Amino acid sequence: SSTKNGRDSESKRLGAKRADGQFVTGGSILYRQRGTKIYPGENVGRGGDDTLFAKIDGVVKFERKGRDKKQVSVYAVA
Amino acid sequence: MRVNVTLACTECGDRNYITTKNKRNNPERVEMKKFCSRENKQTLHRE
RNA sequence: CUGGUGACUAUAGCAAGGAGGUCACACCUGUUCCCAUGCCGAACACAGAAGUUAAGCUCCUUAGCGUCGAUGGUAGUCGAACUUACGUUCCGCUAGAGUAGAACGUUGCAA
RNA sequence: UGAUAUUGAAAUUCGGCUUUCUAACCCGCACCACUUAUCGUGGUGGGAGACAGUGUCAGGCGGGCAGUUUGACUGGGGCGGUCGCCUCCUAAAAGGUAACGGAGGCGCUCAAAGGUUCCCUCAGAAUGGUUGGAAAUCAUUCAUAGAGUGUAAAGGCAUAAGGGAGCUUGACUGCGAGACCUACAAGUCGAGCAGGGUCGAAAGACGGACUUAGUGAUCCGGUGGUUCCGCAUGGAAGGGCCAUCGCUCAACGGAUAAAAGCUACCCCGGGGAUAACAGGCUUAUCUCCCCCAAGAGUUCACAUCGACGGGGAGGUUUGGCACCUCGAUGUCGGCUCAUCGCAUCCUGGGGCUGUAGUCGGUCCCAAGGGUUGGGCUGUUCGCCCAUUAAAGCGGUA
RNA sequence: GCUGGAAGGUUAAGAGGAGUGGUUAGCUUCUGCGAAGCUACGAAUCGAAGCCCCAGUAAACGGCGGCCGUAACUAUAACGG
RNA sequence: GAGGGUAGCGGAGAAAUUCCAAUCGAACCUGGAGAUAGCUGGUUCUCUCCGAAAUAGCUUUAGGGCUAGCCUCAAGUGAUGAUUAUUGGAGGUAGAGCACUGUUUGGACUUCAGACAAACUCCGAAUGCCAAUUAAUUUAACUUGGGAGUCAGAACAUGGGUGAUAAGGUCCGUGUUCGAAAGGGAAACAGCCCAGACCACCAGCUAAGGUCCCAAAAU
RNA sequence: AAGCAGUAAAUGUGGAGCCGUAGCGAAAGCGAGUCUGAAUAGGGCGUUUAGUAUUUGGUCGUAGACCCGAAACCAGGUGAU
């Protein structure tokens, strides 16, 4: 009697990296994901692995994109 | 089968690249137009 | 008030009944020219006499499907005590029912 | 076993194979002398002879002998299985999270399956036709995804990331503010600046592929380039820097360039951190006791028997776990018949009967006393012989 | 394993030195040739045994099988696939 | 019987690992030598202050080690630490449900009723988590240097896997106590309830738990 | 420092040598700046620019290195009463 299972891969630490209402630097990472669960908003871009990152210095806000969708944006408030 | 090759600049200063190729589909040496570092322009790369 | 372009989770939708036209929109004839078809002026692109509400688009009604949606109660649960399944105190579903609901609103050409 | 030194003289044949000869070298061969000795030496006759023996260099055989290696995890060890990477669940709505827990993949492919610019919308169903499923091509209506997306799964994608055409090679060079992850070594994302470019009318997009797997430190060695060094000077050997190649080093952070077994002839240092005997916890298994009553029983569920299903007690079995004991708790059967429990084998007292009587069956009370001798087998167990009122079942390491 | 054989293949040291590189007396491109010496490598050719091969040997080491039918043997197969 | 021979990388053996000075799977003595021992045992006077861990990664690694986490001392910055109130956000568990993917019962003839799900979702909490430069209370936090120990954990409650909804079983998440904690209660009883011992007193009030006698307080 | 003089002293004398005052780069090299790079363009390491000699305490390294304890290995000898 033996087992065929036992295998798993190293866990990838996905999820949100910055909080709503916080000030971030020029190129801070905001969200790690597979696919598009959250869309890039104002002043926010997508990386090659779907990573969302900021492109200015400002405060970050999570928003709503119509229905069943949502987006995150950065605003340059000083 | 899959094999790796090197592209060398033709009739000019050599600026080398590395890539892969399927030997069945491309039995002959491939040719491309790549940038030459020490000639500061695109040239023809053979092999 | 007809048309152009933007913002709002269908409370904007789908479906049925009805009104209308050469200002605008639109159906319509044709392939000489710029353009085009796995083949086909259907589409795309052009030259435009006339012709039609028949069709798209906007207008009034419509709770027939879709969407929205309280109150009260219930399930679950933070914490506290007893004990092993029961008190007390906050928070508070889902489903269902009473209900909205035939959209509100920005900038300019005219009208 | 071959070459070469000791090793010399002549002469046939395509400096060499091959034949004679004697002087080197050899004789545990005979005779003489030292010498009353035949160890040794010398002389003289015979035998052999450039061979053999010996030195240096080379190839082969070689458990006869020697030095060593022969992995880890593990509900004890051995046997079986697994070891690095990717995706989902257990995972308790941030991240992280174990088990020899439940399921699958990878050690690649693509010269267009890459970049850019335009255009398009799938699967499935009915209707009518050379009728192979009206689904092998055809034209309608219905259809928000059930279609496809190289390859597992998850998350995304109809703005399409899906389908089709034109051009092309950014599957470029030097870099890089900032940030995620993290013991280290590594891994991941990245706006912008400069030099070349492709597509597009232009704004713009392009540092491979919808995303996540397709990989291996250092030392050493090879191939190209180069404002470097080069031991008195000038060169050159030999190094340094840049680019790149060679490991199923898969036990995948990789002991070395190179490695398997037996020990009952065994030894030492430790451990109840870990098994075998007994104790302890549990009761799957075991042994007893009940609930329901389809039925059997000449009719008649319950005198007796009790299918399919359900609920308990005990701690005498085989097991599970690993809490004391490895600076030692002696392991089976027998002799002994001591002491205790009652779920009673005989005796004592009763209810029911499918109890005429003599025997029986089943249930209740009761532990006072009693409960044989032999054959076979180391046996416990078991079969048999002859008796008895009866030849009871269990605990006490 | 042992013994015998040599038709071919593989096979060391040792012999042989076709070519190549380093240096420089002389030339001129004005950073390319280059004789004589010394010096770092050298390949075709010759080279024994062994092994690959051929044969014998078991009182040498060792080895001595399966499925399926069939009466003048009722069950069974003498005999056959 | 006497006199002799064979010596340890050896000798002898009618064969047993048998014998070679009461010792032999390789005799005794003296040297290398204080061999090596990731393994047991031990390590000597007194007060004061602070005070752990039994985890992760890699390992010829598993009762060993190295880096990180947790303790202490000295210097520096200094509000950057903690709790609560308000507002904002990311993330699909409990529950529920059948719109997807599978499973399922009874009626019709695609539809109406009724159920199930870790790897199902049209939905969706309580808690926990990240922030502000927003108030009140409190006392920590970060950086650079010197010195460590730790890598065998246990029980209770609760959320789960495994086992048989067995084990004082085993493997993870979340709190407490023991470890390293004396005192009171539970008869006795490290882990359960109450509660943290600087010293002295023949003073007072309480907690858990109790008040007929042992045994302090209601027959 | 060795040495020399001095009572086996104290300390005279002795300036070979050592650390610091300037870094960066593999090196040639340049220098408050250097390396990479076509380019301070960007980036890395420097421009703090106060050390140095003796000594108390803590820890480390080389020597047996806190103490006691093997089963074994090698070398030279003694033994057949």
Tokens of B15: 């600026």
Half-sphere exposure (Cβ direction) of A4: Cα atoms closer than 13 Å: 0
Whole-number Å distance, CA A32 to C1' C31? 58
Q: What is the resolution of this structure in A?
A: 2.9
Number of separate domains in chain B: 1
Nearest to B15 by CA among B31, B43, B32, B37: B37
Can you spell out the DSSP letters for A36-71? -SSEE-TTEEE-TTS-EEESSSEEEEEEE-SSS-EE
Q: Are A52 and A73 in contact, with CB atoms under 8 Å apart?
A: no
- Which 15-54 residues of chain A approach strand F with CB closer than 7 Å? 15-16, 18-23, 37-38
CA distance A36 to A70: 10
A61 CB neighbours strand D below 7 A: no
Please, which experimental method was used?
A: cryo-EM
Secondary structure class of A24 (helix, strand, coil): strand
- DSSP codes joined into one string, B19-40: EEEETTT--SPPEEEEEETTTT
Q: Do A27 and A51 form a contact (C-beta atoms < 8 A)?
A: no
What whole-number distance in Å separates Cα of residue A36 and Cα of residue A71? 10
Nucleic acid strand C: bases within 7 A of protein CB: 9-10
Å from the A22 CA to the D119 C1': 45
By residue range, what is the domain housing residue B10?
Answer: 1-47
